[PDB]
Amino acid sequence: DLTQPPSVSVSPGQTARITCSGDALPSQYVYWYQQRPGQAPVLVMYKDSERPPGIPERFSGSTSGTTATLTITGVQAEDEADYYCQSADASTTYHVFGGGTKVT
Amino acid sequence: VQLVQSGAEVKKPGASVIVSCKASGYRFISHYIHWVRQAPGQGLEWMGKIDPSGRGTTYAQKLQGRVSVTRDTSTSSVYMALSGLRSDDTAVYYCARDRFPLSDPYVWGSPLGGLDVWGQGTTVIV
Amino acid sequence: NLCPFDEVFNATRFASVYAWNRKRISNCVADYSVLYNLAPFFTFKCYGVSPTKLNDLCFTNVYADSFVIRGDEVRQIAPGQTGNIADYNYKLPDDFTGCVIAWNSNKLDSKVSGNYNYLYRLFRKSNLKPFERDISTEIYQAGNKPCNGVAGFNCYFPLRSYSFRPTYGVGHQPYRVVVLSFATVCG
Ligand SMILES: *[C@@H]1O[C@H](CO[C@@H]2O[C@@H](C)[C@@H](O)[C@@H](O)[C@@H]2O)[C@@H](O[C@@H]2O[C@H](CO)[C@@H](O)[C@H](O)[C@H]2NC(C)=O)[C@H](O)[C@H]1NC(C)=O
């Protein structure tokens, strides 16, 4: 089961650190989804370090320990969206999403 | 690649959804398909995953026995079957891909999840 | 009670060989039938039991160490063997009582740029005790004057990482390894 801070606030040019902590994540990848309010979510960040094509080279990731973090360096005005972390359970079944951190 | 969804619908508590995910483009027997629901204004939560080669189904722990998916190789589509709606089960149902091109059948410990090519989403109303 | 073996075998992130993850398995019923219906590259080798006779037994504590090594170093994961993975990374004991399970993963651990996420301890002062784990990144002084922290030149970095490109040979692709070691757990 995966727990996450409910919201963060940021001013542009700063650095936003979205974090996700789960007890069943020493051994599972974490995949981040960036849902703008209204439309379907998109995979913004995947496999704890890797970046899908179609994303600007700004969305990083770190899973040092049992707490995955996403970091936005230089937040712009279009990154105001939800950020759900993801995992599975410790086997690979019963995938779990996160708290739903709002970025403003 | 793209995934086609069904239309918006209004149901009653009882027989509810045959919501459809007609897939196209990619080789249908490669990626898993995950179904994810979202209560309006709430977090995303994961319902079930289907292997299109019939190799297994798995639904969520708190939704067991209520939702069942149905594969179809012929039309390249996958369905749900949920029964007994409540106001809790009012959501937008997202069909998604898996983003893992497995070539040889299943190496143990594939990165399941990583839902890439999410469908357009359809809405259930109670 | 259905002992978690899918929690060790199907875990997507396998730890590096110097820091192998150990999962205690106890107080359950272990069904081993998902370990001899295998896909055709698995290397189910048991030392002290036999694969078809694991069900009708009860073990006190079952330990499941999992890691990722090169293909030609699965031979090193065996009792009483000497190489680099055995000497400095993972020494199975002389009297081993479990099974050693390894399968090809030329997928899953292999980028086109090469996954340098997996590290093996190339240099150490002494060989390992059986089931010992040395996770520290301390600089190994290898000659005349042991200095404070200067990297290189007989003051080497121990944890040299693998390179796991998918166009490498069969003996170099990363072979995910799970080492079961063996009353609560039954069948
Ligand atoms: C490792 O996982 C594979 C894949 O199965 C998926 O995830 C599993 C954790 C499990 O929950 C399945 O329901 C999921 O579909 C497992 O392979 C399955 O094994 C069963 C019985 O051995 C077999 O009937 C299925 O056809 C297999 N599916 C495939 C694609 O081969 C496997 O069992 C898991 N390994 C262990 C140690 O349990």
Tab-separated table of C-alpha atoms in Angstrom, chain B residues 100-112, chain C residues 9-12 34 38 42 103-105 107-108 176:
chain	number	residue	atom	x	y	z
B	100	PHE	CA	6.190	-4.000	-22.381
B	101	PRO	CA	6.914	-5.675	-25.725
B	102	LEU	CA	7.459	-9.236	-24.522
B	103	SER	CA	8.827	-11.372	-27.362
B	104	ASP	CA	9.605	-14.709	-25.745
B	105	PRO	CA	6.466	-15.707	-23.739
B	106	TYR	CA	7.125	-14.614	-20.131
B	107	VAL	CA	10.462	-14.058	-18.436
B	108	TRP	CA	9.760	-14.116	-14.691
B	109	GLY	CA	9.496	-10.619	-13.299
B	110	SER	CA	8.394	-8.513	-16.213
B	111	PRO	CA	7.665	-4.853	-15.399
B	112	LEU	CA	3.897	-5.140	-15.372
C	9	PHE	CA	10.450	-14.724	-7.978
C	10	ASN	CA	8.217	-12.152	-9.660
C	11	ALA	CA	9.674	-9.094	-7.914
C	12	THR	CA	10.587	-6.722	-10.709
C	34	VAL	CA	5.350	-23.444	-9.719
C	38	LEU	CA	9.177	-23.910	-15.779
C	42	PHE	CA	15.438	-22.119	-16.064
C	103	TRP	CA	16.952	-17.969	-15.580
C	104	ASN	CA	18.020	-15.868	-18.538
C	105	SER	CA	17.010	-12.262	-18.466
C	107	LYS	CA	15.303	-8.739	-21.301
C	108	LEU	CA	14.485	-6.800	-18.134
C	176	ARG	CA	18.534	-13.433	-12.580
